[PDB]
Amino acid sequence: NKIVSHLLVAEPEKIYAMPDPTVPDSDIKALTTLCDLADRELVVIIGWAKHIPGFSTLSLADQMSLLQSAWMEILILGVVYRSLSFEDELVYADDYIMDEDQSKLAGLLDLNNAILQLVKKYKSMKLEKEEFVTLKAIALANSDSMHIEDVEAVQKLQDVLHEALQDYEAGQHMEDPRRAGKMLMTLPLLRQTSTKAVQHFYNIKLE
């Protein structure tokens, strides 16, 4: 499926977190490290969104609305995929892998354990890189914003990406004719973790 190939080649290069080595470890350092990593990931996510077919043909407002509603889900799906080959550890970056102790010290134990629940499920499903890049595009298109202008166009985008997933799964996993549906059913947990994380992100006043 062409869309998948396209998403695969438009996939952004790895970003380093570069935690400040002179700063003592604390919950503030973790939050600062993560706060700066996401900022840079966000800039790249925008450049990546423009590669999704049909996306840059939406109005500017509609483009913002989607990103503004899906940014956290996308950042979270990334750390999750980077962590599939690990155990009880989240790889925010190659130079910033958080274990349970660091999560506790960061006051993110509950949140990270929820991100680990997502990872646990995808490991079980043997989530391929192709499904990762597509699910990420879908999460953006299906972000459920309230301020979309052209609802038809956004639903259109949703459909072309959904079709790519369905098509990919139809040819790569003939052994499971319901894989695509299983993949779509992992989205609720993603939405759930994302909204809870966004909540925390505001309680902390990050901005």
- Which spans of this chain sit near ligand OHT (rule: CB under 6 A)? 31, 34-35, 37-39, 41, 75-76, 78-79, 92, 108, 111, 197, 200-201, 204, 206-207
Reduce the DSSP state of residue 106 to 3 states and report it. coil
The CB-of-57 to ligand OHT minimum distance in angstroms stands at: 27
The CB-of-72 to ligand OHT minimum distance in angstroms stands at: 6
Reduce the DSSP state of residue 95 to 3 states and report it. coil
CA–CA distance, 34 with 97 (Å, rounded to integer): 11
Nearer CB in complex with ligand OHT: 115/180:
115
Q: Is 134 exposed, middle or buried (0-12, 13-18, 19+ CB in 10 A)?
A: buried
Provide the strand spans (E) within 66-116. 90-93, 96-98
Nearer CB in complex with ligand OHT: 145/172:
145
Nearer CB in complex with ligand OHT: 40/182:
40
Nearer CB in complex with ligand OHT: 76/161:
76
The CB-of-142 to ligand OHT minimum distance in angstroms stands at: 19
Nearer CB in complex with ligand OHT: 95/167:
95
Two tokens, residue 28: 């503030």
Q: Give the gyration radius of the chain's Cα atoms.
A: 17
CA–CA distance, 77 with 124 (Å, rounded to integer): 16
The CB-of-98 to ligand OHT minimum distance in angstroms stands at: 9
The CB-of-35 to ligand OHT minimum distance in angstroms stands at: 4
Answer whether 127's CB lies under 8 Å from 136's CB: no
